[PDB]
Amino acid sequence: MLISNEWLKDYVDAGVKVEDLAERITRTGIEVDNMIDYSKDIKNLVVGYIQSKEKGSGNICQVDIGEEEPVQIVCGAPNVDAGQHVIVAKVGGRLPGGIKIKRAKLRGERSEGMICSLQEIGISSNVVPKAYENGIFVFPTEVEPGTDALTALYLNDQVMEFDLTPNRADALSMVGTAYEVAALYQTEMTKPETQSNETSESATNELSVTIDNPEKVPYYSARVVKNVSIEPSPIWVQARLIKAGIRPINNVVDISNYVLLEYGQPLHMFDQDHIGSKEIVVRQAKDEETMTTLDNNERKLVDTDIVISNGQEPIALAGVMGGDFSEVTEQTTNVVIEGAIFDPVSIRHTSRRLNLRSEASSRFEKGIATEFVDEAVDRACYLLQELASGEVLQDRVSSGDLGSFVTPIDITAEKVNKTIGFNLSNDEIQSIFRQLGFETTLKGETLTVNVPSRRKDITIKEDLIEEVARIYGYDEIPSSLPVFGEVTSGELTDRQHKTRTLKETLEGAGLNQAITYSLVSKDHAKDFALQERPTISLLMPMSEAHATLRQSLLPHLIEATAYNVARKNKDVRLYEIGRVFFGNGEGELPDEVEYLSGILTGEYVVNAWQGKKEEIDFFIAKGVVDRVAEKLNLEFSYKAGKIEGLHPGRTAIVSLEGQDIGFIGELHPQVAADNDLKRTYVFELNYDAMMQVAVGYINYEQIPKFPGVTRDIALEVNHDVPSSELKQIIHNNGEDILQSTLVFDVYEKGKKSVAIRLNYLDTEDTLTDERVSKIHDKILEALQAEGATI
Amino acid sequence: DATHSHQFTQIEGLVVDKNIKMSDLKGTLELVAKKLFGADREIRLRPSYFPFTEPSVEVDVSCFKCKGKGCNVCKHTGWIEILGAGMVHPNVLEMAGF
Amino acid sequence: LMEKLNQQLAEETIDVTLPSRQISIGSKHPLTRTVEEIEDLFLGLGYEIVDGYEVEQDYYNFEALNLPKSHPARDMQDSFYITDEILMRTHTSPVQARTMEKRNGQGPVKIICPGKVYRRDSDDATHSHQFTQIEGLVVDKNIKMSDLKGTLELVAKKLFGADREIRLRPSYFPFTEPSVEVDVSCFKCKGKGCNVCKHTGWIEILGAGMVHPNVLEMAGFDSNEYSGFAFGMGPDRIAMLKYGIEDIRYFYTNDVRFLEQFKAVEDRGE
């Protein structure tokens, strides 16, 4: 929102330069994002009167500039003429873009200065009125030659740009902002004149208004002013529109933009003698109704759209765009003025659908102050009198009820102080509400604050708390800490704690913590998933890279390894703990399951000068996963397997308590090769499953005071059998006293040798050679019978 | 791009009790700011608006680089915005049963 | 190629059942585990953790804890004295007295001091000339024994599980008044009774009570204004209880067969 200082001073004076104004407004709630200075880079700009013009062969002009003698100015501009008051940069003068005004000679003829376009004093074409767009500017009325031009133009001015919050629609206007400034500086604000010299007729006899959709149109009024003559607006209207980024059009069209800016009330003008009727009718559009906007585009309506009509026919999209016949033109002489409140959501959706967003429609979206609907109509009627030769009919034709324009809210100072941490008296609080221009009465220890409808943000008394605090000052709010009366020690949950610990142990082993994107390409969303299960796609992805949730962490960890490797980062070691997502079908939240995965390639251990290089292989990758199981006190088993992206003779499934919870494996040589990767290993695990095992306290065993016994057996097997199966019977037969086993060697045509070292021990009772041979030989017999030589 | 991510991270918190004040939110923010950026940090609270809180604030930390001269890091204001906050809104409490 | 890379595939098959290349994990000392557990409980209640000297002045070891120069406690026979006035500390309370005095008489104080302590005794399976204590000390303005009791309850749950209850038995220490000896409900037998708890269903884990007026005042705090509670416990004992460790000396002998049993996380179980 663009607020001119110059202009604002019509309603309130803060007594202060514009920079101090901005700073105090910013401090108290409304951000001034910047300040536009219309005087900038301009020197020696004065009004001239063009006394005579010769064009026997450039345009040579004699210009009164308030000196003794006229100056000759050569000006090539298609619209310059005698009789015109104009803008002159004098010799010695400066204009934006580093332009210098020199004594000169054009085609052998003196020029003492330059007559300017608005663009040439820094105005954007976007907001230059059509009349002067492709030549020079001409003042709409007479001004004394020699007068300061910027001052005459109402552009010797700075303009604050507010970047407002939705809270503060009130500052979408000059009148709102002046109420804010008047509070801040504790000074009087004055609204403008809206009393017109009214005729003997009434609009009651001119016009009917009926509202058909009152759920959707809380109010609609109109007034009539007759015998308007259309011509340029005065220069202060023009310049104020310009400073606010609106192109001036003409006196009548301009009045409605002006009063929009002044009061915040969107106004519409219809040619009275072209409504096509003497009834206005507000209602919904009918499904697949058409209209044509002023615009000459044809607008397919839906029934959610509000139109204005007469009786057969839409004369406008309400609040959004006029139609192609009821509008003001150069020929118009009688006008009807609308002041209506339309439903915010209706307007927001219509303008968005049809890409017909305007400054006026955004006012309807952000909500309208009831206190100013009639007053702002009355203001435009007044201005039309004053600047459009208008004749103002008595009365208003309206439908609907605006409420009360104050809403009382009760509050105590205890509630204020206890919410904020303040110690203000009723006096100081009551004075704040008055400062803000709120009538506030104290009965006992209760203030009734009479909150005017021009602050439509304030409805409940927490709203009124923020006023106090922002006005009195957030700087002044005391620093405390809450004292809780129910005492609890703050700690990580078990799961939270284990997760910190586990990350620590993965970092301790050389793995970097990754964080990958949850969203994958729809093609890859089911990559590495083991249960078939629906994937979850976004209605509106911004990228095909990020269209579908993730049923595995491995696609992006593979990508991430591919990326590092391409950048010559050959040693990649990463882990992630993150959610994957599985559809519970339609309209249902998915299962979000926390995984633990990682990926490894390169050296694990390197010291070149010693000739040390240990390349990551599968058993390193298992070591990582073993180390996760150790730290967590969990028992994992491992059986050969076949998966998706994986080397089929170097992949294993991982089980915990007879549940499969993940896998480890080398990437398929094809997938490696696609990604320019060397030998690479990944693992993926259901962390949710892991975290369900309650492991309790560590089970301590006593330290043996005497030795145990170690025997190494040597087997022969289906070269073809899992070592896991040996370990399992052995350990099934070793009872009380088998402490540990180790496969320490393998050989392989058709059979393999497995050397395994058994460690017997009894920390509890006295171990004997007789029990150890009894058990040993029952071991080697369980082995023989589940199919084992030696 | 370099300053915008479709996936990013938040930390929020919420305290609900019986005489909870904005002084109490302020002391909490001060500790947060020190935690993150050092024992000497101060904060600044600027008025603002979020639908779920009332009053609302936007929260700056004194710049940890320039004492408070001003620098690139803090856009030569000496304050850097790090948090928003404010009092939970009545409707939010009540829809939740408090 | 779909011959050759295909029979490379097969020359590359492995028993995935074989021993991983271990990436070995070192152990956290059982005594450190208990101390840190207790650190964490009390950090979360707003307390600080304080360390002090292991070799201490007899004023802070004794005098400031309400043991005048007479007192039998100060026997040269039962503490490791280095001079008349300097000795290995016998408890971590010197640290807490040195800490209070520094506060010149303003609270709160809320501190937890773990550390090594020293006693002139012969070593066996239940006695160690060097062992460990954790004490703490809260000094504030309306501090009650109800407040020491709730604190002890959390401690006991922290150590031995959410279901633990405590019992307070009257007792006597010179630095506190009232004093208590503190039992935890046995974590093994529900409350039937067992070897672990000597078939009483209660196990003694802590002593505590209200800080004694003289102790407050010698340190500068005003005992008309400020009360106080304090407490001690012994991780050596706690951890022998919790695990069935058979010999206190096992903590200080560093058999890796003992140490290396304490690699893994634990939980509240079920």
Ligand SMILES: O=C(Nc1cccc(S(=O)(=O)N2CCN(c3ccccn3)CC2)c1)Nc1nccs1
């Ligand atoms: O007051 C304490 N701690 C305290 C309170 C009661 C019980 C125990 S305890 O069980 O571990 N204890 C250890 C010492 N024992 C002693 C020591 C000397 C004499 C008698 N008995 C008794 C048992 C410790 N410390 C303070 N620091 C500063 C101010 S008060």
Ligand SMILES: [Zn+2]
């Ligand atoms: Zn800075």
Ligand SMILES: [Zn+2]
């Ligand atoms: Zn028992």
